[PDB]
Amino acid sequence: AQYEDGKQYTTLEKPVAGAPQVLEFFSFFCPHCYQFEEVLHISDNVKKKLPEGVKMTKYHVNFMGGDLGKDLTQAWAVAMALGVEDKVTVPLFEGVQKTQTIRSASDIRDVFINAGIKGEEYDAAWNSFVVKSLVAQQEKAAADVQLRGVPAMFVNGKYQLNPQGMDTSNMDVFVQQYADTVKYLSEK
């Protein structure tokens, strides 16, 4: 066929019930994730090819960058609670990988302050039980698929995108292939 298991995607041995429709995992320490966000705009090109009624979920993971990796997963929970993902994603990526000015929880916090989120508002979110459960959800979703690498995308709890098996001569072509694959899995 044109789309085949083990080619553009793989199938989970252990499917996950009740999972978000489109589930994306990343790390601010993850170099292809940086590309995925800054250069390829994957999430966004996928989103536009998704139909009506499809929600898109993105989660951070702990297994990169040790102690700071976990701080980053909590900070992403803050970003999700306050609805400011689109204001911190880029400075967080560049702070970790480009300028390397993010070295502590305080530095993460600085990124949010510079983006216009208020100190009081950030620290209250940071310490809130709503953020604790949001951290819990991020870990639970990754655990459910026994996640070992990022970037990773899963569709309806049962398919996992396999970008290795797509052409990378052309960056634009890679992205369309990726999003068209998400759409195909979507309709399955």
Side-chain angles (χ1 to χ4, degrees), residues 28 34 37-38 85-95 111:
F28 284 114
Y34 189 110
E37 168 65 26
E38 299 261 293
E85 296 92 333
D86 295 343
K87 295 180 177 165
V88 295
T89 291
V90 168
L92 283 171
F93 265 115
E94 306 194 347
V111 165

Side-chain angles (χ1 to χ4, degrees), residues 12-14 16 25 63 139-149 154 160:
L12 297 178
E13 222 86 46
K14 263 281 186 34
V16 165
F25 293 98
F63 59 81
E139 302 185 7
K140 176 180 182 294
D144 283 344
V145 298
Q146 216 173 354
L147 184 67
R148 297 310 321 260
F154 297 86
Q160 181 181 350

Side-chain angles (χ1 to χ4, degrees), residues 53-64:
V54 208
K55 83 176 311 293
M56 215 152 155
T57 310
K58 171 134 81 194
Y59 288 160
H60 197 266
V61 296
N62 290 344
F63 59 81
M64 300 187 79

Side-chain angles (χ1 to χ4, degrees), residues 10-23:
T10 56
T11 299
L12 297 178
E13 222 86 46
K14 263 281 186 34
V16 165
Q21 283 157 298
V22 183
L23 185 45

Side-chain angles (χ1 to χ4, degrees), residues 65 75-76 102 138 152 167:
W76 189 246
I102 291 181
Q138 289 183 90
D167 197 330

Side-chain angles (χ1 to χ4, degrees), residues 65-78:
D67 201 89
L68 248 193
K70 287 207 85 188
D71 277 325
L72 281 169
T73 305
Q74 196 167 341
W76 189 246
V78 174

